[PDB]
């Protein structure tokens, strides 16, 4: 409850919004980041190098098909499959039809060749895909075809069903498929699955799928390719609506867990022991409602470190000590690294090298708009040399 | 350029209506922090010490209050608070262990600004005073003790804005604004008025004017040189005095209504940055190579103040205050800044030769920028 | 008795307070703004700042006050006021003189028991034996024109001083006129 150091960020720029956005606003792109507004409005952040200097840029950018009474709900774009190039983005918004909601799917992708990179030419090229239920998140998958591989696009639905869409390389447009083909695990729910993670294998051909509903129920599964099978599945049932869960390795694999009642809480080991070794992350829920997630080396130490964004406009950092370090008293567990605090709750984040140097910035979208905080350089610099000092030491007495 | 969100800030309530120059920040009690000092129309000024929501003590003076100050008017090496009202009063309080005055005497009425400082140079400090006439007097305590008149200079165009620059040789200048982005030099001879001209669209603008702005570290006593105006039809201007013709760094338009001009070191280098505040709450800080950083307050401002202040764990830290309209105050405290342009790391660490010489060591040649990358990709996020 | 007056205007009200604070008259202008509108708006300020005029109206009160009691009935001066300290003092705060008032003063200098005799046949001389220990000071009023004004013309002896008034809302040869004439009239009525 008392962090153990101060915050190594510090403050770039801050391009202000003239409305709100959701958890669902942020956005990669390209190193872009695509911001979208309630009320339609899109913006593109990036930086322009200017001969000793950097300049931010955020411009704003136009889609075709979105009515001026539409809202925005949700947006995700990425990257085609390695053989084959490309940008999708795609927007899911509800138009106002009187007094009910009629909810759109657009799909953004240029085909024309030279042009599957130009985001101005790709904002004009979209389909147009009613729904019949109201959408929640728009994420993505890579599955394996054949020898092959593919990206496919997975939204939750307001029924509580999850509707998978995938390229059709003969007319080139985008159909829905059954969901039960590819993800066997996706299958049979009963509450509004509000975020959803597929982790994939690097090397090999399995997966694991986590997901969070409205009513609390986690579900995870590790899941076979190859075969379309489930080899196993475990489920929880917490309180309060499941904002984030996320899968990452803590050196072995571990499952974060953010609800919104109740701390933030991490699930080790999943492979070999399930859902019983769990490890809450101390007075991280005395800061409102935890809205956001993020798991990523905010240290320069080689290992992982977790990020925990607030309503109460708070920015908690959880470090884990190992148990290499032998302290079984204060045994391997999470505490407090730092803690930052803004002005506005904070809505979505993410972690991309904007600048172009190798060092990461962290991007952080709040009520008021889009803050760029970056890593203080003098420390960053005198960390660097010290480091490389000692490799050559290194190399100098290994060589002779 | 660039744009910043300062969080961390202390709200204070005052219920109250005052003028654009009753708020200061100094030491009252002498004891090498600064305290927040405010003077309210109703006649009562308020002190407000480390970060207490409730004024630390309250004084009473009679009349109307102008102008406030904290200095050493009494040249005995003790701060004291010195307080003008309107009608022509002049009050003097020691809090240096409510608040009876420990000194009063009448001078002429309708004052508009105030300044503490050794104008001639004789190691004394003396007052000036400005009105709302364009008559500026001049005064100096003398002891028995009491307050004894001096030069009196009269102008055109209106007073807003009194300050002391080091001149061209190593000598003190009272420098006054004048509308239309002028200003003007008084004589203290003991023309009296030199009139000086800076472009410009009216001829009616309200101008404010600061002048002796730090250059370096531990030079504050030994130099000054600079000075700055700023225009209500949003136009800044850094000049620098020197002999033949003062000299113009440089000068920026914004759209805002400005009214109010002070320095702040938030960089922390020893060089003082100009500070600006517009009536909607818009503040620009610029540094001496026109590197602007802008911060808005989405409110309403009265009066605007900057400088240092002791808020938390008995320290001074640089700190702007904001006076809104809803009977609240703003102290943000946090308002240091590690540089003022951007610059990511590879240009920084491009400055040092060792980094130069501790990869040519390593064979590898600096001009391929995605190597180097890569380079510092694995050292940073890969260190073994 | 604090008064307080409005004037709403397109980009938003102004309002003025007048009050009482000890020996003083003061005057205080707000503003309430309800870019090119707020121009506009500090403009008409700037304007209405410069028409306070609050100096040359006390430089008229008081002058149109002396001329009004110069016959001595007025209820405004009671008994016990030397009037000649008074416009000594108004002198001293006032020896500029404003640019927008309307009336004019001058003073000039110009045998004790001869005064007694002459404040004792001051009817004689068309004089007034107003006093003010009662020194008294003779005056003498009338009205004038030139291109309508009352001068007045009041000698106190200390060697006599005597003052010119003329007395005409606030927007010299013609004082110069009476100023001819003032010192002429006591040597020609000094046998």
Not at chain 1, 95 to 108: A, E, M, R, T
Not at chain 2, 177 to 186: D, E, M, N, R, T
Request: net charge negative.
């Amino acid at each position: 409850a008392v962090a153990a150091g101060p915050c190594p960020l510090r403050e770039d720029s801050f391009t202000r919004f003239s409305s709100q956005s959701n958890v669902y606003g942020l956005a990669g792109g390209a190193g872009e980041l695509l911001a979208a507004t309630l009320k339609g409005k899109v913006l593109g952040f990036r930086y322009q190098d200017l001969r000793q200097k950097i300049r931010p840029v955020a411009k704003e950018l136009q889609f075709n098909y979105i009515p001026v009474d539409a809202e925005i709900v949700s947006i995700d774009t990425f990257n085609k499959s390695p053989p084959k190039r490309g940008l999708v983005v795609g927007i899911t918004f509800i138009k106002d039809s009187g007094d009910k909601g009629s909810p759109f799917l657009n799909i953004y992708c240029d085909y024309e060749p030279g042009s599957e990179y130009n985001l101005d030419s790709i904002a004009q090229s979209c389909l147009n895909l009613e729904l019949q239920f109201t959408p929640f998140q728009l994420c993505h998958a890579e599955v394996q075809v054949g020898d092959q591989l593919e990206t496919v696009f997975l939204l939750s639905g307001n029924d509580p069903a999850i509707h998978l869409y995938k390229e059709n390389e003969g007319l080139h447009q985008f159909e829905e498929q059954p969901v039960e083909n590819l993800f066997p695990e996706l299958t049979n729910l009963t509450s509004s699955v509000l975020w959803l993670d597929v982790h994939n294998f690097p090397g090999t051909s399995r997966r694991l799928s986590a997901l969070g509903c409205q009513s609390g129920y986690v579900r995870v599964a590790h899941v076979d390719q190859r075969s379309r099978e489930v080899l196993q599945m475990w489920s929880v049932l917490q309180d309060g609506p499941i904002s984030r869960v996320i899968v990452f390795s803590l050196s072995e694999y571990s499952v974060l867990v953010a609800s919104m009642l109740e701390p933030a809480v991490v699930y080790r080991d999943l492979l070999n022991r399930g859902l019983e070794d769990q490890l809450l992350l101390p007075g991280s829920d005395q800061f409102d409602s935890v809205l956001c997630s993020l798991v990523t080396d905010v240290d320069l130490d080689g290992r992982p470190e977790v990020l925990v964004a607030t309503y109460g406009q708070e920015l908690l950092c959880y470090k884990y000590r190992g148990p290499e370090s032998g302290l079984p008293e204060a045994q391997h567990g999470f505490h407090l690294l730092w803690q930052r605090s803004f002005s506005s709750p904070l809505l979505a984040m993410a972690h991309v090298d904007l600048t172009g140097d190798g060092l990461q910035e962290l991007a952080v979208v709040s009520l008021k708009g889009v803050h760029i905080l970056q890593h203080s350089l003098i420390q960053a610099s005198e960390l660097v040399l010290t480091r490389l000092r000692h490799q050559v030491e290194q190399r100098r007495r290994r060589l002779q | 350029m660039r744009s910043v969100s300062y969080v961390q800030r202390v709200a204070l309530e005052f219920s109250g209506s005052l003028f654009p120059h009753a708020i200061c920040l100094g030491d009252v009690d002498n004891d090498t922090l600064n305290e927040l000092v405010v003077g309210d129309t109703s006649g009562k000024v308020s002190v407000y010490k480390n970060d207490d929501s409730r004024p630390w003590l309250t004084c009473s003076c009679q009349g109307m209050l102008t102008c406030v100050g904290v200095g050493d008017v009494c040249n005995k090496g003790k701060n004291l608070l010195v307080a003008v009202s309107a009608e022509g009063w002049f009050h003097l309080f020691d809090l240096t262990p409510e608040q009876r005055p420990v000194f009063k005497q009448h001078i002429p009425a309708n004052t508009k600004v105030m300044l503490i400082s050794d104008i001639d140079g004789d190691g004394c400090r003396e007052l000036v005073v400005g009105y709302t006439d364009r008559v500026v007097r001049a005064f100096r305590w003398e002891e028995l003790g009491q307050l004894v008149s001096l030069k009196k200079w009269m102008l055109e165009g209106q007073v807003d804005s009194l300050s002391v620059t080091l001149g061209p040789l190593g000598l003190p200048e009272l420098m006054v604004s004048q509308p239309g982005c002028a200003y003007a030099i008084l004589l203290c001879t003991w023309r009296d008025v030199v009139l000086h001209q800076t472009r410009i669209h009216n001829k009616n603008v309200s101008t404010h004017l600061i002048g002796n702005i730090k250059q370096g570290h531990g030079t504050e006593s030994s130099g000054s040189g600079l000075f700055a105006l700023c225009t209500l039809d949003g136009t800044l201007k850094l000049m620098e005095e020197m002999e033949e013709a003062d000299k113009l760094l440089w000068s920026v338009q914004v759209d805002h209504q400005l009214f109010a001009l002070e320095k702040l070191d938030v960089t922390g280098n020893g060089h003082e940055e100009v500070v600006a505040c517009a009536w909607d709450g818009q503040t620009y800080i610029i540094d001496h190579n026109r590197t602007v950083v802008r911060f808005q307050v989405d409110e309403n401002i009265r009066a605007f103040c900057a400088g240092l202040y002791a808020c938390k764990e008995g320290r001074n830290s640089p700190c702007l205050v904001y006076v809104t309209f809803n009977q609240k105050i703003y102290v943000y405290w946090e308002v240091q800044l590690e540089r003022m342009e951007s610059t990511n790391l590879v240009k920084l660490l491009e400055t040092k030769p060792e980094y130069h010489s501790l990869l040519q060591e390593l064979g590898v040649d600096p001009d391929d920028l995605p190597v180097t990358r890569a380079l510092l990709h694995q050292t940073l996020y890969h260190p073994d | 008795t604090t008064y307080h007056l409005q004037r709403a205007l397109p980009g938003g009200i102004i309002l003025m307070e007048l009050a009482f604070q000890g020996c003083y008259f003061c005057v205080k202008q707000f503003a309430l703004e309800c870019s090119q509108l707020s121009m506009l708006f500090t403009e008409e300020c700037d304007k209405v700042r410069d028409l306070m005029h609050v100096h040359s109206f006390s430089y008229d009160f008081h002058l149109r006050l002396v001329h009004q009691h110069v016959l001595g009935a007025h209820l405004v001066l009671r008994h016990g006021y030397h009037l000649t300290t008074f416009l000594r003092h108004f002198l001293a705060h006032h020896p500029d003189g404003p640019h927008f008032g309307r009336n004019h003063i001058y003073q000039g200098t110009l045998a004790h028991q001869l005064y007694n005799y002459v404040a004792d046949h001051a009817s004689s001389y068309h004089m007034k034996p107003l006093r003010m220990h009662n020194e008294y000071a003779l005056v003498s009023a009338w009205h004038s024109s030139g291109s309508d004004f009352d001068v007045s013309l009041l000698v106190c002896h200390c060697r006599l001083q005597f003052f010119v008034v003329l007395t005409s809302f606030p927007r010299f040869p013609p004082l110069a006129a009476e100023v001819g004439m003032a010192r002429a009239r006591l040597a020609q009525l000094v046998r």
